[PDB]
Design a protein around this ligand. Structure first.
Ligand SMILES: [Nd+3]
Ligand SMILES: [Nd+3]
Ligand SMILES: [Nd+3]
Ligand SMILES: [Nd+3]
Length: 105
């Protein structure tokens, strides 16, 4: 779950596209019943039930891929307070960085 796992272009950092691509792959593997959404049971250990509600604007109890990717973007921004478009190893290790990793691993 280090930088290298999420950095296909070998610049040493994760950009928003790289985080989103990893988030999409994580979404797909976290939805084995192929309904196109993630519920609290599927996200256990990564996103708590309390945090899921905050990420689900239409309050249907699940996250579709668009909602999940929006959550990835919000967590990327939260882990990148210098607003420089990339997450480095220091930022990935931060508490906010760990929450990004839990969405995209
Ligand atoms: Nd990169
Ligand atoms: Nd599902
Ligand atoms: Nd929803
Ligand atoms: Nd940065």
């Amino acid at each position: 779950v280090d930088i290298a796992a999420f950095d296909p272009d070998k610049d040493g950092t994760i950009d928003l596209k790289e985080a989103l691509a990893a988030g999409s792959a994580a979404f797909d593997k976290l939805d084995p019943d192929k309904d196109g959404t993630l519920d609290a049971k599927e996200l256990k250990g990564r996103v708590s039930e309390a945090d899921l509600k905050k990420l689900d604007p239409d309050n249907d109890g699940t996250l579709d891929k668009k909602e999940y990717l929006a959550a990835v973007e919000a967590q990327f921004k939260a882990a990148n307070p210098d607003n420089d478009g990339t997450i480095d190893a220091r930022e990935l290790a931060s508490p906010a960085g760990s929450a990004l990793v839990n969405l995209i691993r």
